[PDB]
Amino acid sequence: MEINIGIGEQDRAAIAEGLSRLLADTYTLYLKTHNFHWNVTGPMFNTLHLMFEGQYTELAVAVDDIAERIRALGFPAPGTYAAYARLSSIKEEEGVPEAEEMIRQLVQGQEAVVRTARSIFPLLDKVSDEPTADLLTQRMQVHEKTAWMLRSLLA
Amino acid sequence: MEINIGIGEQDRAAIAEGLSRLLADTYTLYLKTHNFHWNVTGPMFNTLHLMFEGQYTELAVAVDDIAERIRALGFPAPGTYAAYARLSSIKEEEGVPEAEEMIRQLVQGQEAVVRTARSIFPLLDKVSDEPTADLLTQRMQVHEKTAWMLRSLLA
Amino acid sequence: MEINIGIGEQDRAAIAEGLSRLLADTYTLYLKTHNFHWNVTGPMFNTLHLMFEGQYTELAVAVDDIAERIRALGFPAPGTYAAYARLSSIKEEEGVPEAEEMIRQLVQGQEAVVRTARSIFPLLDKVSDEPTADLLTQRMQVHEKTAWMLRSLLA
Amino acid sequence: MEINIGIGEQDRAAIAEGLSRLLADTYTLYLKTHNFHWNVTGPMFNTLHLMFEGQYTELAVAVDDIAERIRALGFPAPGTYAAYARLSSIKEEEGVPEAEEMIRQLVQGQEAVVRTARSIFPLLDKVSDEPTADLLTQRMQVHEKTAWMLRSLLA
Amino acid sequence: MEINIGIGEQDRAAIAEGLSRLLADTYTLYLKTHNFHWNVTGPMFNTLHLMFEGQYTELAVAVDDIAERIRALGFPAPGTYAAYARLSSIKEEEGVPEAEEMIRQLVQGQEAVVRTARSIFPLLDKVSDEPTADLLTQRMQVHEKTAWMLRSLLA
Amino acid sequence: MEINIGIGEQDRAAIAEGLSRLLADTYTLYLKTHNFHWNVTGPMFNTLHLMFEGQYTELAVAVDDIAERIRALGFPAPGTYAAYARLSSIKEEEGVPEAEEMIRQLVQGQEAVVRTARSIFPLLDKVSDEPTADLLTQRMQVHEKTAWMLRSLLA
Amino acid sequence: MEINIGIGEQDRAAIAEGLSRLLADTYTLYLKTHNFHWNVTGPMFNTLHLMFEGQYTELAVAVDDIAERIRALGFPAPGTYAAYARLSSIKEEEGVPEAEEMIRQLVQGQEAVVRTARSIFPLLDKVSDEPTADLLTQRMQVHEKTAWMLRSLLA
Amino acid sequence: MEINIGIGEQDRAAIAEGLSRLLADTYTLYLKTHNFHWNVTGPMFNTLHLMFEGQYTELAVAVDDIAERIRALGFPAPGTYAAYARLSSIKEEEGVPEAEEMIRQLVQGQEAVVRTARSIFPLLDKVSDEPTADLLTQRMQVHEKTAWMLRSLLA
Amino acid sequence: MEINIGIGEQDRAAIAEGLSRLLADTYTLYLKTHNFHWNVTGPMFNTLHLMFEGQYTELAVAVDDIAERIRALGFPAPGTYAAYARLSSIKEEEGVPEAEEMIRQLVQGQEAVVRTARSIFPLLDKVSDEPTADLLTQRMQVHEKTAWMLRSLLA
Amino acid sequence: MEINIGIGEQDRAAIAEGLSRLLADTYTLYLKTHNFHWNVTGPMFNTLHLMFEGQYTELAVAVDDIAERIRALGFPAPGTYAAYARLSSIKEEEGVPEAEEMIRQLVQGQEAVVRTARSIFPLLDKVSDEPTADLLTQRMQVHEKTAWMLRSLLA
Amino acid sequence: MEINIGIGEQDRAAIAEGLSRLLADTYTLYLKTHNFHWNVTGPMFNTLHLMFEGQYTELAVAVDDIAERIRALGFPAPGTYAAYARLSSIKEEEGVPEAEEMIRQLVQGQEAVVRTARSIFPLLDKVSDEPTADLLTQRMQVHEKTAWMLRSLLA
Amino acid sequence: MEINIGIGEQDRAAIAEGLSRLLADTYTLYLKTHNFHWNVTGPMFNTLHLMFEGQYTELAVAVDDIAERIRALGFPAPGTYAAYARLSSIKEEEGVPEAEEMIRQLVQGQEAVVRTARSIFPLLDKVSDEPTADLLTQRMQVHEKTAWMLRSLLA
Ligand SMILES: [Fe+2]
Ligand SMILES: [Fe+2]
Ligand SMILES: [Fe+2]
Ligand SMILES: [Fe+2]
Ligand SMILES: [Fe+2]
Ligand SMILES: [Fe+2]
Ligand SMILES: [Fe+2]
Ligand SMILES: [Fe+2]
Ligand SMILES: [Fe+2]
Ligand SMILES: [Fe+2]
Ligand SMILES: [Fe+2]
Ligand SMILES: [Fe+2]
Ligand SMILES: [Fe+2]
Ligand SMILES: [Fe+2]
Ligand SMILES: [Fe+2]
Ligand SMILES: [Fe+2]
Ligand SMILES: [Fe+2]
Ligand SMILES: [Fe+2]
Ligand SMILES: [Fe+2]
Ligand SMILES: [Fe+2]
Ligand SMILES: [Fe+2]
Ligand SMILES: [Fe+2]
Ligand SMILES: [Fe+2]
Ligand SMILES: [Fe+2]
């Protein structure tokens, strides 16, 4: 069926491409958060184990909402290691850093998702894609709150 | 009691008339979805009976939130067959189509409501009615997602 | 597949037409109750806003139960403005009455549905359709209880 | 201790005999629906697996309500394969039919239960046993609704 | 407001008087069951304490339903020691019987309420008050089942 | 089996005597609250119908706690119309007052229970029955708060 | 579609034959337990009515898991009176024994299912079917625990 | 750690200052609503006791959410009597008005919060702080809905 | 309506003034705890953020219980910054202390409420106001427990 | 840091010692009840298995509340076998009594805890430890109620 | 701190390596199932969308459990795209297959995980690691069951 | 009654002897964990207070499951201080260690329970006691997981 929702095929494709970057970033942050949740040690084990669990749990829902916005726009959602490693702007950590370095990396990762989302807005303004604009806003709200919570631990 | 929320009486009346068409479209889609939920038949009965129940259940909430934004703006909310037929841009199915046709009509229904919501955004462009704009957006998200789920069934 | 439930084709169709009128009254009353819920004002707003909410929420379930008794009997359930306006015996209200008058009409509404339900029991005398007799009975109980609670507000 | 509920010993014994048949049909249908729930295959596996799950789950309460009405009437409730195969009128299926045939046998199964319920009302005409009457009524209504939903799959 | 539910004042008043007797019996049984719940002793304390608790909890809702059927019929619901002693046919117990006599007495209690219910049906023959007939049918269901459970303890 | 909880038999029997008055007062107020919940009418019906439901629901628990404290002191708990009419200091209402009068009587009912409770404290202090003293305190808290809400309606 | 789970077809068939016996035994104990739940009488009625309900409720889940392990091994699951009376090794009770004998029959029924499970392990060890061995282990845990609870009543 | 969320320290501090006024208004209205909840009298006591409870409950969540957006922007959140007194624009009531005056003062308090929020948007449009704008918007939607409900009581 | 709960006007008024100080102390501790919840930083952020949230959530309910006991005594509940600044014995904090200092201050705050409540017992014993005495006792228990938990963090 | 809850080191120490006896008694009774829960046999198995489970579950919460009152008083809470064997007045049982002897021992254990509790009120009379006195009273309430339920089984 | 759980360091390392492959396999199947959940289309959309959600939701729990068993054995859990790509034996799917081919791929995926799990048992038997063996068995039970449900759709 | 479950009397007795050591160990660890939950102080108070509560809560269920396996094997379950201090292999701590030492002892406690379980498996393998073997496997899984979480805090 034709898709008649007030955005042309070429603009939908372009929003889908930006959202694909956002998805890869969110999913990469999801796995890293899940990773640090397993692997963190030291006197903050209990608090960071729990904190990270709440974060990756929220991220899993976000991954699903971002992907399904892509589907609503008429495009398949990417979902492989290869696609996400290419599309993602988050630094992957292959070892096991100390707790404070895990915290910093996760702070940076929240800001990376925010940065990716800020890059998509001018496009959304130009085509007046209000639903996608609201989704980006919610993600920034969540990632900027999570950033305050994480960095507060470092003071 | 004087209403002082930063939108003038004339402005609020135009917005209320906009939302009144959204409401009527939403309510008309509600009943059509409820109809098809009762009357669909075929090997897709169980999944369509259920999917349509989820849709009209969500729409019952939406009509109430729309009706009550009208009231917050200071105007009665319409609620009769006569006033919805007048305001509704959706054509009702008086018979019982095949299941594929039901699905096709419900996709068109979602798109009809998205259309009505887009027509109201300029009204707000002047007056700084952020709450109504968010409501229009939330409705576009829901209907654009439901469009995807419905049409995916055709493929 | 043939229907073999101890009721013949001609009878099932007659009972279906009966319930189609009960459906139409229940739904029209549902919409009016939901209407008054939005638009009532005065010192009884909170109590009436809440009472009418409870009422239309119950009626939404009743319409579904009535529609699906129709399908059980082997006939389509009606569900459009035009079909309900034809079949309905409910006094439509297009304006916004004072609170006391909303209560009064809502009382008459309950008694209208009771009346429609009573109009159907003779079709079940010779036929012995106990399920429909129980459905009719339950609606009478609910609508007569609601009539008491509403008219008590006037006294 | 004497049983004094307004029904004579020979009347109760006779209603119990009839409910013993209803129990045996319901239980036989329960087992068969559980059978199909496990063994059905084909593209409708997910919908029928769940649909048959919902039905046998409801029938598990039914068999218990029927048995305990027999105990209320002051007689033992039957509960062995031997007693249920004697009393049952459901055609038992020893193989694994295709999905469409599983559905038809369950449509018949519902109609078989309704038929048994109807054969019991005359016993109650003479004696005024309103509880048992309402039990047959509610069983008739569940099975007739279930039969609508099952046969809607075949069109 | 005129009450217009298909039962005239004179017939409504006769039913109300019948229900007032049923309300008084149910309530006197509620208090007796509550009494025994507190005062029973001996090896069956735990099982009877609990069983009786379940019975009086269900009776507390029944009195409310009966009383409110009387209001629906348009008459006041009795609620004083004086009025219940007058209307009630339950033999009050002023001492503390042994557990087995408590049980036998609560069996008689159940049968007594059934007896009162069985007496009201003729007033309904003439008038066709289907909601009230269903109320009595339910109460007979509950007390007859309860009577099976209670007397089973004595064998 | 002997009771050895730090209170001699005759002191326990005196405490139970007071608690029997408190019980009878609580149950009488329970029934009158239940009565007014059924029978109250006028503009306040919804709010009073509800408020009295919360009150009698609470009192039904209190009745049970008072009765079981009597049991714990080793005495039977009174539970008949005759014992409660004798023990109760609450004047019953055989008619149907206006709503403002219902409120008025229920306010005084709370104070009647507080008065019975206050009379028992000197005995509790004398024999140092801390649990009963705490129970009476809780009832006074509840009844005094309830009086404030009732009488707030009259201003 | 091919089944490739580390167990050859002939070995899976032999596992399915053992589980078909386990299934029939579990379902037979299910019906018997359900029977005794209905029909038991005497001073232990309340405790045995509830204890037997817990058991048959858990057995209903068990028959579903056993059946579906058969399905996962690639064979249809037996589900008729004929198949179960043939595959089952538990003597059914056609009558209504005393409470003490019902308990005894149920202890032995637990041991009967355990005995059938134990006969299957040498096969499971030979072919290394770890999931089925765990399923049998879980059944033995439940049946041996239930045996202890039942026989504890007789002492 | 640096804060890199797309907004420079200077604009963040000014957004923080505007939110501090929003927080002080929200919290002052919270306490006043709590106050009126405790102290309102008259026939509308139940309705407003409950209504004001719902309002201050919601407002307690809102003060948390505003305070934590301030923290996410990198500034401390004010939380003292002195600070909220300096920062709030809401008239404080040192006595106990009549109910109508309580309603009117709370209608104005909604509108004052809405007005403080409208004063903040210019700053956020110039800086594309989408999360804070959504926060301001939700606050407006709630207070404007609350103002409809409250003023509706007066008519 | 007169207040008759066994305590004269003058005594009730002196109790209300004591409870007014208790309320002011509790609300002031409530806001300071909320303040610290928002603004604490350092490696204990997560544990203190959560701990302080549990504390202020509990104090919100205590605020409401203290104020409503004032009302039950027949006096209006104070609730404004002016009243609480006048009545409160708690040292307020206008900056953002280090985590260890926040803890120590919250310990002090617990002890200040205890101190205020201890100051009120002499009056309660002379007049036998048992409910208010139980209230103070519950507050002292809660605050002395919270003090153990807070001060345990310092060790 | 320092403890300023108005009791004074020497008295807190005396009260802690008494609560240490209470804790030891409560915990010894917890284990004994748990022991009888596992080991009881005979016709009362189900009822006492469940009843003893209800009791030890409640005691688990009580040992925690008693221990933490000791901590609130500024002293460590004992918790080893050696300590509890020293502080405890409860008669340890090394075998498996008959059911009736199990009940009798548990009655005696409730009374042992009551007796220990009563020995502590004098340490409090001088000192004004309202929270500890309330804890003793709640424990006495629970154990005296449990004593009634237990000994009711013997009568 | 030393790990003393009855398994030497070298064997723990080797078990951790096998579980790492299981983890990578499980997580790759997680993402693919999640991918097909977003991207599947056609008449089975609703059923497969739901079915795949159930599966990936379960797999998300399994990835956590497998990783935390690796942590209990004393070794870091892998969690990056590069590490899973290296360890995983699952075939990635970079496009959007037809629904029948999605099904067949997920069937194969279940079998691949089962195959990885079977490869680990030999090591588990040399060293008696019961918990890890039980983990492998549970995973095999889940995936073999899922395999049946999936391939049942193809038939 | 004869216990017939495939294990002879001397073997069951030897299993019960091993499970009695396990139980004693589990119970002792339960009390020590509860002890440290009360008495731990320092900046980790909040996180260990909570962590230890989770552990001791789970150990109370384990205590119950191990004891009831002993009962199901036909032997009494030990439950006294004297028997547990004799059967148990865990060092009792009679003081209040520093937090890190509490963690250390709790790690060793988990490993002590594992060690006791390891000593029992050879017997279970010899006689093929599958249920007890699964119970020990679960206990090893829980304690090895807990050992990881505790020692992760030390690092
Ligand atoms: Fe975890
Ligand atoms: Fe999804
Ligand atoms: Fe439905
Ligand atoms: Fe609404
Ligand atoms: Fe609303
Ligand atoms: Fe429906
Ligand atoms: Fe299933
Ligand atoms: Fe049952
Ligand atoms: Fe009780
Ligand atoms: Fe009611
Ligand atoms: Fe009601
Ligand atoms: Fe009770
Ligand atoms: Fe039952
Ligand atoms: Fe199943
Ligand atoms: Fe309140
Ligand atoms: Fe917060
Ligand atoms: Fe937070
Ligand atoms: Fe309140
Ligand atoms: Fe148990
Ligand atoms: Fe605790
Ligand atoms: Fe979805
Ligand atoms: Fe985890
Ligand atoms: Fe605690
Ligand atoms: Fe247990």
Chain D residues within 8 A of C4 when measuring between CB atoms: 111, 115
| Nearest one of E59, E57, E72 to E27, comparing CA atoms | E59
- By C-alpha distance, the chain E residue nearest J148 is E41
Contact K97, K108 (CB under 8 A): no
Q: Is C40 left (phi over 0), alpha (psi -120 to 50) or beta?
A: beta
Ligand 16: centre distance to CA L58 (Å):
30
Handedness of CA E63, E66, E72, E76 (dihedral sign): negative
User: Per the CB < 8 Å rule, is D5 touching E144?
Assistant: yes
Q: Which of G1, G3, G131 sits opposite K137 (nearest CB)?
A: G131
Task: Return d(Cα E35, Cα F68) in angstroms, integer.
Answer: 11
The C-alpha R_g of chain H, in whole angstroms, comes to: 16
CA distance H92 to chain B (A): 19
Ligand in nearest proximity to the CA of L148: 1
Burial L67-79 (b: 16+ CB within 10 A, else e): bbbbbbbbbbbbb
Ligand 16: centre distance to CA H61 (Å):
8
Ligand 19: centre distance to CA A13 (Å):
61
- By C-alpha distance, the chain A residue nearest L47 is A46
Task: Return d(Cα A115, Cα E26) in angstroms, integer.
Answer: 70
Task: Return d(Cα G71, Cα K144) in angstroms, integer.
Answer: 10
User: Per the CB < 8 Å rule, is F35 touching E79?
Assistant: yes
Residue type, D121: F
Task: Return d(Cα G46, Cα E44) in angstroms, integer.
Answer: 10
Q: How many CA atoms lie within 13 A of A9 on its CB side?
A: 3
Contact L138, G134 (CB under 8 A): no
Residues I121, I125, I131, I137, Cα dihedral to 10°: 40
Chain L residues within 8 A of A47 when measuring between CB atoms: 47
Ligand 5: centre distance to CA B74 (Å):
15
- By C-alpha distance, the chain A residue nearest I39 is A152
Q: Which residues of E touch J (CB under 8 A)?
A: 40-43, 45-47, 49
Q: Is H3 left (phi over 0), alpha (psi -120 to 50) or beta?
A: beta
Q: Which of L39, L68, L85 sits opposite J81 (nearest CB)?
A: L85
Q: Which of A47, A149, A154 sits opposite I47 (nearest CB)?
A: A47
Contact H15, H123 (CB under 8 A): yes
Beta carbons within 10 angstroms of residue E11's beta carbon: 17
Task: Return d(Cα B153, Cα B151) in angstroms, integer.
Answer: 5
Binding-site residues of L for Fe(2+): 11, 37, 49, 53, 64, 68, 134, 138
Range of the domain at C98: 1-155
| SS3 call for A135 | helix
Q: Which of H133, H138, H144 sits opposite B72 (nearest CB)?
A: H144
Q: Which of C104, C136, C145 sits opposite E72 (nearest CB)?
A: C145
User: Per the CB < 8 Å rule, is E154 touching D68?
Assistant: no
Contact F34, J107 (CB under 8 A): no
Contact B55, B117 (CB under 8 A): no
Tell whether residue J49 is among the known ligand binding residues. Answer: yes
CA distance G119 to chain K (A): 21
Q: Which of L47, L48, L152 sits opposite A41 (nearest CB)?
A: L152
Ligand 16: centre distance to CA A57 (Å):
19
Burial class (CB in 10 A: 0-12, 13-18, 19+), D66: buried
Residue B2, CA distances (Å) to G114, H101, H149, H151, L54 in order: 79, 15, 14, 9, 56
Task: Return d(Cα K30, Cα I153) in angstroms, integer.
Answer: 42
Ligand in nearest proximity to the CA of H45: 15
Q: How many CA atoms lie within 13 A of G100 on its CB side?
A: 5
Beta-carbon contacts of residue F121 (< 8 Å; ≥ 6 apart): F133, F136, I128, I130
Chain C residues within 8 A of F47 when measuring between CB atoms: 47
Contact D105, D28 (CB under 8 A): no
Q: Which residues of E touch C (CB under 8 A)?
A: 1, 3-6, 68-69, 71-72, 74, 128, 130-131, 133-135
Q: Is F55 left (phi over 0), alpha (psi -120 to 50) or beta?
A: alpha
- In L22-112, which ranges are E strands? none
Q: Which residue numbers in chain L precede an interruption (C–N > 2.5 Å)?
A: none
User: Per the CB < 8 Å rule, is D144 touching C131?
Assistant: yes
Beta carbons within 10 angstroms of residue L104's beta carbon: 17
Ligand in nearest proximity to the CA of B148: 21
CA angle H149, H150, H154 (to 5 degrees): 115
Residue D95, CA distances (Å) to D36, D101, G75, G83, H96 in order: 10, 11, 12, 11, 80
Burial A51-70 (b: 16+ CB within 10 A, else e): bbeebbeebbebbbebbbbb
Residue type, J149: M
Beta-carbon contacts of residue L132 (< 8 Å; ≥ 6 apart): L15, L19, L69, L73, L120, L124
Ligand 11: centre distance to CA E29 (Å):
21
Q: Which two structure tokens, joined as six digits, stand for I148?
A: 């153990």
At residue G17, φ and ψ (nearest 5 deg) are -65, -45
Chain C residues within 8 A of F41 when measuring between CB atoms: 152, 155
Residues C90, C96, C98, C100, Cα dihedral to 10°: 20
Ligand in nearest proximity to the CA of F50: 11
Beta-carbon contacts of residue G14 (< 8 Å; ≥ 6 apart): G123
**Residue H103 host element (H or E):** helix H99-118
| Nearest one of K55, K56, K39 to K146, comparing CA atoms | K55
Residue C116, CA distances (Å) to C14, C44, E128, E129, H15 in order: 14, 30, 15, 15, 62
User: Per the CB < 8 Å rule, is K1 touching L140?
Assistant: no
User: Per the CB < 8 Å rule, is D118 touching C6?
Assistant: yes
Chain K residues within 8 A of L140 when measuring between CB atoms: 5, 130-131
Beta carbons within 10 angstroms of residue B13's beta carbon: 14
Contacts of B among chains (3+ CB pairs under 8 A) = A, C, D, H, K
Task: Return d(Cα K95, Cα K98) in angstroms, integer.
Answer: 10
Number of independent structural domains in chain J: 1
- By C-alpha distance, the chain K residue nearest D47 is K47
Residue type, B132: T
Chain L residues within 8 A of J84 when measuring between CB atoms: 81
DSSP collapsed to 3 states, chain J: CCCCCCCCHHHHHHHHHHHHHHHHHHHHHHHHHHHHHHHCCCCCHHHHHHHHHHHHHHHHHHHHHHHHHHHHCCCCCCCCHHHHHHHCCCCCCCCCCCHHHHHHHHHHHHHHHHHHHHCCHHHHHHHCCHHHHHHHHHHHHHHHHHHHHHHHCCC
Binding-site residues of D for Mn(2+): 37, 53, 64, 68
Residue listed under structure tokens 């355990």? G114
User: Per the CB < 8 Å rule, is E149 touching G40?
Assistant: no
Contacts of I among chains (3+ CB pairs under 8 A) = A, F, H, J, L
CA distance D85 to chain G (A): 7
Q: Which residues of A touch I (CB under 8 A)?
A: 44, 47-48, 50-51, 149, 152-155
| Nearest one of L25, L7, L127 to L86, comparing CA atoms | L25
| Nearest one of D18, D22, D38, D5 to D122, comparing CA atoms | D18
Q: Which two structure tokens, joined as six digits, stand for I131?
A: 């409910």
Burial class (CB in 10 A: 0-12, 13-18, 19+), E89: middle
Q: Which of C47, C149, C155 sits opposite F47 (nearest CB)?
A: C47
CA distance E130 to chain G (A): 32
| Mutate: best of I81, I93, I94, I106, partner H, most H CBs <10 A | I81
Contact J114, J148 (CB under 8 A): no
Beta-carbon contacts of residue I10 (< 8 Å; ≥ 6 apart): none
Chain F residues within 8 A of I1 when measuring between CB atoms: 104, 107, 151, 154
Task: Return d(Cα J34, Cα L26) in angstroms, integer.
Answer: 14
Ligand 20: centre distance to CA J137 (Å):
20
- In C19-67, which ranges are E strands? none
Task: Return d(Cα D112, Cα D89) in angstroms, integer.
Answer: 7
Chains K and H touch (3+ CB pairs under 8 A): no
Burial class (CB in 10 A: 0-12, 13-18, 19+), H5: buried
Beta-carbon contacts of residue H123 (< 8 Å; ≥ 6 apart): H11, H14, H15, H18, H129
CA distance K33 to chain A (A): 9
Q: Which two structure tokens, joined as six digits, stand for E70?
A: 């009387």
Ligand in nearest proximity to the CA of D148: 3
